[PDB]
């Protein structure tokens, strides 16, 4: 009963960051070494937990959150960051315990003339609560006139396509991200290292 981390990190399809995908992991053995000994990841930041000790720790639930963002924005997937991604798309709590793992997906998620399939939320009235997921498409009032579901000057669609081309500066190349959260409640600890 091996954890399907393969399903998560090696997936063919990754979600848009605004409508980020969550896998709840339970009832499996997690060999964490297969991640951290990998050469495949360019960012591997862990908050409040060490990947080397997870191999003999049990948790009630582990959450795998996956999505695509551009290189420049990987640094916004951290507690206490601000910017479009942090504020309007995916928000870590201050006291986050988990790992932030990312890799360049230019070979898959770029194409000549641009991949535009990947979106982000550009506008919102207020910041996301931590781990909030907002899939509303209500017209955004940017000026002093109410929109009531009609686009115009200062009345915009809240989402926008990233433009991923293979020649793009690394800052503007697509990155796949997985975020692992660890949960330890007073219930059967079903997510265990091999030891």
């Amino acid at each position, epitope marked *: 009963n091996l954890c399907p981390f393969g399903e998560v990190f090696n997936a063919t399809r990754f979600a848009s960051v605004y409508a980020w995908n969550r896998k709840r992991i339970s009832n499996c053995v997690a060999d964490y*070494s297969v991640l*951290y*000994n990998s050469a495949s*990841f*360019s*960012t*591997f*930041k*862990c*908050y*409040g*937990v*060490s*990947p*080397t000790k997870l191999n003999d720790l049990c*948790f009630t639930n582990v959450y795998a959150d996956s999505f695509v963002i551009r290189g420049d924005e990987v*640094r916004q997937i951290a507690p206490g960051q601000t910017g479009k991604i942090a504020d309007y798309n995916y928000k870590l709590p201050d*006291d*986050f*315990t988990g790992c932030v793992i990312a890799w360049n997906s230019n070979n898959l998620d770029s194409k000549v003339g641009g991949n535009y399939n990947y979106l982000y939320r550009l506008f919102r009235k207020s910041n996301l609560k931590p781990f909030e997921r907002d899939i509303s498409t209500e017209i955004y009032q940017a000026g002093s006139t109410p929109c009531n579901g009609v686009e115009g000057f200062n009345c915009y669609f809240p989402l926008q396509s990233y433009g991923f081309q293979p020649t793009n500066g690394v800052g503007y190349q697509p990155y796949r991200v997985v975020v692992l*959260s*660890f*949960e*330890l409640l007073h219930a059967p600890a079903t997510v265990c290292g091999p030891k």
Partner: antibody
Amino acid sequence: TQMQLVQSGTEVKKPGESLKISCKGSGYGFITYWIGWVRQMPGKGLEWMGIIYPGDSETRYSPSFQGQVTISADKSINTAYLQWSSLKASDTAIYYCAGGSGISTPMDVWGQGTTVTVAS
Amino acid sequence: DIQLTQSPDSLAVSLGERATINCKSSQSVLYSSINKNYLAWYQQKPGQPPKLLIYWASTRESGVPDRFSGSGSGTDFTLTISSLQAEDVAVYYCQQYYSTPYTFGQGTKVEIKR
């Protein structure tokens, strides 16, 4: 062993000279590790200086050492650096680099330390 | 900013007896994600790097003898060496990793009573 850190030779410097000591992480999985510097002066306690994630060189200084030292890291050689611009007599001590594969993590790997001494 | 002070400063205990070391913090070091305290215990012998013995206040590190035991919650923690031995004589530092900047205690000497 997963990870061992190796530190630069012991340094015989004189006041005013600058110095940049090193700490090279040997092992697979270095991308996970954050390198921390600890200062311990002869007979005195451990003093935490700063920590750096070589992934993107995110460094944090303790208020006791902000602006008094700089902490670089070269991710491409698993090396972290502790540099001065002008060594004071103040600065004679042993310097430990210490690794934990995370932030808010216990430092489970310690180098041999490098002793720096600022006088003829 | 958290500050930790150990009690006592120094300590002498005869072979076979128990030594205990307090470490009280300015502010509580409990993660809520996982009901764990972010405090640890270091042993340093003359001419040696610090050795991690205890993390999460109460979990023993690999290659640390059974007699070493860490405990406490909130603000007050203790590290108790049952059955003191020859090769236990050293300085013991407590350390929090709840937040940066990381901070240590003043340290505590343990020696043999005779």
